[PDB]
Amino acid sequence: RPGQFGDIQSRTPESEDVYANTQLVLQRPSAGTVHVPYSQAPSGFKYWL
Amino acid sequence: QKFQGRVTITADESTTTPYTTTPYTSTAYIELTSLRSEDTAVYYCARDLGPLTGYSYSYF
């Protein structure tokens, strides 16, 4: 689950079988700017540390 | 010192909001007053980096 330990998971330190549930949402750009804005829960690992 | 009090140089406020992600523009005007034949010339506006380059004197 997002923003908690194990928000991203991987069966081994070399597997490509990534599971992730960061609840990433893309948001509408603004003011004639070219960029991509978004919202996601910050890394649940960085929090757990 | 030759042109002060002969001349008025002035400009129009371009935008007061903390924006312009649009292309920037600025507009200037010059008035010459009490004209004599010897004031005849071609006149150029030119861009100057003097203030941006640490308030140095100009190069155009």
Partner: protein, 60 residues
């Protein structure tokens, strides 16, 4: 029009008390009006003519 105070004499507020080059001639005389015209509406007309309008030469 409207009328300035000089010391006893009066003059129209757009017009000078003394010219040409009002302050540049006589600083300690140009004191006389700026003592007491502070309450009057004409002060910024008198000040423009005396000290700023066209750097004491031609036209704005």
């Amino acid at each position: 029009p409207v009328m300035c105070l000089l010391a006893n004499t009066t003059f129209p507020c757009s017009q000078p008390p003394c010219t040409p080059c009002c302050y540049e001639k006589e600083p300690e005389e140009t004191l006389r009006m700026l003592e007491d015209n502070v309450m009057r509406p004409g002060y910024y007309q008198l000040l423009q003519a005396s000290l700023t309008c066209s750097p004491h030469r031609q036209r704005r």
